[PDB]
Amino acid sequence: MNILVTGGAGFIGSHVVDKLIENGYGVIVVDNLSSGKVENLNRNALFYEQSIEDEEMMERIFSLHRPEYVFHLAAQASVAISVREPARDAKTNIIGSLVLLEKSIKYGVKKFIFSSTGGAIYGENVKVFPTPETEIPHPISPYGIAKYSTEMYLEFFAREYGLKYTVLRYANVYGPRQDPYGEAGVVAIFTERMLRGEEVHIFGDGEYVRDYVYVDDVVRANLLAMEKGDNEVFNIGTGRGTTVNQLFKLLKEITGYDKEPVYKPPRKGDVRKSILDYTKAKEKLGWEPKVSLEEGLKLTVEYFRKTL
Amino acid sequence: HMNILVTGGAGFIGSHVVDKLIENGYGVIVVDNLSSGKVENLNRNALFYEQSIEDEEMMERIFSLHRPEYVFHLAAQASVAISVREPARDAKTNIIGSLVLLEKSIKYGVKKFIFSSTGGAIYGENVKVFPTPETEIPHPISPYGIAKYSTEMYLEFFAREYGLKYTVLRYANVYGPRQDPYGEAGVVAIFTERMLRGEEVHIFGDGEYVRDYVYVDDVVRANLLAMEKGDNEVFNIGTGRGTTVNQLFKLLKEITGYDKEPVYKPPRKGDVRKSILDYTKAKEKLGWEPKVSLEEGLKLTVEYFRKT
Ligand SMILES: NC(=O)c1ccc[n+]([C@@H]2O[C@H](COP(=O)([O-])OP(=O)(O)OC[C@H]3O[C@@H](n4cnc5c(N)ncnc54)[C@H](O)[C@@H]3O)[C@@H](O)[C@H]2O)c1
Ligand SMILES: NC(=O)c1ccc[n+]([C@@H]2O[C@H](COP(=O)([O-])OP(=O)(O)OC[C@H]3O[C@@H](n4cnc5c(N)ncnc54)[C@H](O)[C@@H]3O)[C@@H](O)[C@H]2O)c1
DSSP, rough: EEEETTTTSSSHHHHHHHHHTEEEEETEEEEOSSSGGGGGTTSEEEOOOOOTHHHHHHHHHHHOOSEEEEEEEOOOOOOOHHHOHHHHHIIIIIHHHHHHHHHHHHTSSSEEEEEEETTTSOOOOOOSSOOOOTSSOHHHHHHHHHHHHHHHHHHHHHHHHEEEEEEEEEEEEEEETSSSSSTTHHHHHHHHHHHTTOEEETTTTOOEEEEEEEEEHHHHHHHTTTOOOTTEEEEEEEESOOOOHHHHHHHHHHHTTOOOOOOOOOTTTSSOOOOOEEEEEEEEHHOOOOOOOOHHHHHHHHHHOOOO | OOOOETTTSSSHHHHHHHHHHHHOOEEEEHHHSSSOOOGGGGGGSSEOOOOOOTTTHHHHHHHHHHHHEEEEOOOOOOOOOHHHHOOHHHHHHHIHHHHHHHHHHHHOOSSSEEEEEEEHHHHHHHOOOSBBOTOOOEEEEEEHHHHHHHHHHHHHHHHHHHHOEEEEEOEEEEETTOTTTTTTHHHHHHHHHHHHTOOEEEEEETSOOOOEEEEHHHHHHOOOOOTOOOTTEEEEEEOOOEEHHHHHHHHHHHHHHHSSOOEEEEETTTSSSBOOOOOHHHHHHTTOOOSHHHHHHHHHHHHHHHOO
């Protein structure tokens, strides 16, 4: 069986590719290497260094390989970049998604599994925590708006053509191979600086709460979504909130760092609190996180140590 | 003379907005790629660039040179049927194009951005409350509706991020002189042209689809009122009265003196059953209400088509 993974040279995408290759699937990867890395690529997967926005190239790839599943992880996934360049962000995040969906219909993809966001989608005025999928989205960043837009388009393709889909709204994803710019980029920033004995900056009062989910658990959610959760949106998170101050403290103890953080003015657009309810994924996908924040951070620190 | 930019100014509604601004003494720049607009609609007193709103380099030149104080953004792919067949192309004009304009608007100090949106394609297919207020949760089912709603969310981002003031005008079914047969009230032009030529007229399904028909001159007045009032607000612009396709046929038959019965065709996929907009908020905050009754507006429309 052929499977297409977009964004497969990236952080989460390369872990998804590895797992699929392990399980014996034929994997085709499309990635333009804008933020992904050649070193992340699996030598067993077929690789096209192309952009998902390129209609003629996507036409070619789908026509040759007719993937039965598409795991769509390719995105401009830095919130700050989306703010500085909203049109460019949307070209990748919305238009690129639409190109893939148009080809998916034309070439009979069975199911499309979309990586979306929980933290950037619910908005800044949520009252229910941990937050369920029944809360109406109110995204405030171009990245979150783009992701929500694409979720609506997915429902259109399902209604119009019968395409099956699953949307996975990840919480803050961290672990080996992550760069410092994604939704949990702070894990990498803190880890690399602490291991190098450099100064660490915290924005505002550090009391911003996030839901940190380990990459291996996110990968498992993707694979469970192959045969379960048709035409459903799922939060993928831990339901446990951690402040930046708490995260700093945990990484400090693990790394042996012995300096205090330096507090800086708050950044624009920083949502105060994000914690996801994964009850739905538990009930319908059979998914629960297996890796505690303590264990995940130790595995992450170990990866960065080896890099040094 | 204050400079104003009107995108889509060669189109149906946009050309009337241009005429009114010129009549009121403004300097008007028009950007239109004539994909659905017509040179014969263009006001010769406006400065016309035959360009695409998605063209970042060209929009940079236009905004840099003219520094418009207001932008009336009417350029769109506005056929629902085309959006269903070509969602990626629709989104490039509707979302990416809007984002290019907004990026330039922020850079060059635009004071207010007035956006043409849609009531009918935004509220979706399961509305229970009529006439429908802006508090109704959007559930768009066509790519056009999704794109419009996405752009509304982006407008809120630019306002929060940079202090750009905006107004969103969600039109009902707009009809009148210069309309083509493809827009949301395309039926009026279709019925009128065919009745004047004594040709067969087709009614889809049972003809019981209800729409809220608003005359173009009234829509133009809402655009002008939004220059000084309604900062950062979304407004339905409609009449609050519903008309079936069968009743529209009867009215136009009477006016044109058409002497035949309609021919019924199968129902269209995705035709929402009923759309009627509550304009109370616009009445209160913009001071807007329709001045042209449906009977009066249809007569004026028939007059235009006769001459033409
Ligand atoms: N990291 C998180 O915390 C987090 C949270 C919520 C959602 N997500 C989502 O998960 C997915 C993966 O995120 P990530 O953290 O691994 O980021 P990533 O940057 O490492 O992965 C994205 C990959 O997509 C590629 N890419 C970007 N634009 C492309 C284009 N036009 N054509 C082809 N390839 C393109 C990049 O090169 C990159 O390899 C994304 O959809 C992202 O939005 C991530
Ligand atoms: N019943 C209606 O007509 C109705 C209802 C609700 C909303 N609206 C909205 O009102 C606006 C005007 O609609 P209209 O009925 O006058 O349609 P229209 O097609 O006559 O006007 C649109 C204009 O935009 C131009 N255009 C399209 N793509 C462009 C691009 N990439 N760059 C520059 N110009 C481009 C077209 O050439 C055209 O002249 C649209 O935003 C539409 O969505 C219309």
